[PDB]
Design a protein around this ligand. Structure first.
Ligand code: HEM
Length: 150
């Protein structure tokens, strides 16, 4: 991970961090619309008609919480992911998510969406899209290595 790539992820991410709840709702409703199978992991959310979800309290709150943990990841991001504080964030995900058997594919599908919603807030170029993928790849690689114990 570059020095220009780290700074690009920080500069652009601030724009999304300014409106966490509005971005989180957008993120979750694209995600469940485009990948409806992932609804099975959230029993409480299928119990509700789809067009009613955006305006549901547990649903806005949960969107925000996903992005606020991502926020911490971006803050501890250094060149070549050199700062152990980065591993911290995603070891914390490991111990929160290990209890469900959510498989790798499901996390990849969410990355697709998160990365798309950032695009709709700020215009990324190819190099910045590329760097956002390496970010989440690395976060996911850390999380799963830690879940491999259990
Ligand atoms: C970017 C990757 C992800 C991050 C940063 C993230 C973050 C979080 C956070 C912050 C919580 C809240 C825990 C609490 O309230 O104490 C949570 C819970 C949860 N996560 Fe994720 N998550 C990610 C990916 C996923 C994926 C892909 C799934 C499966 C579709 C998933 C399933 C769940 C479920 C079912 C809960 C419990 C919801 C609840 O009880 O309200 N997570 N996660």
């Amino acid at each position: 991970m570059n020095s220009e790539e780290v700074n690009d992820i920080k500069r652009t991410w601030e724009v999304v961090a300014a409106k966490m709840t509005e971005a989180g709702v957008e993120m979750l409703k694209r995600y469940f619309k485009k990948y409806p199978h992932n609804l099975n992991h959230f029993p409480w959310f299928k119990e509700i008609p789809f067009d009613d979800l955006p305006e549901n309290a547990r649903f806005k709150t949960h969107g925000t919480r996903i992005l606020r943990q991502v926020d911490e990841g971006v803050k501890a991001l250094s060149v070549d992911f050199g700062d152990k504080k980065f591993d911290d964030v995603w070891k914390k995900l490991a111990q929160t998510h290990h209890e469900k058997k959510v498989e790798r594919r499901s996390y990849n599908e969410l990355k697709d969406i998160i990365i798309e919603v950032v695009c709709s807030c700020v215009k990324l170029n190819e190099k910045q899209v590329h760097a956002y993928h390496k970010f989440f790849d690395r976060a996911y690689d850390i999380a799963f290595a830690e879940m491999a114990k259990m």
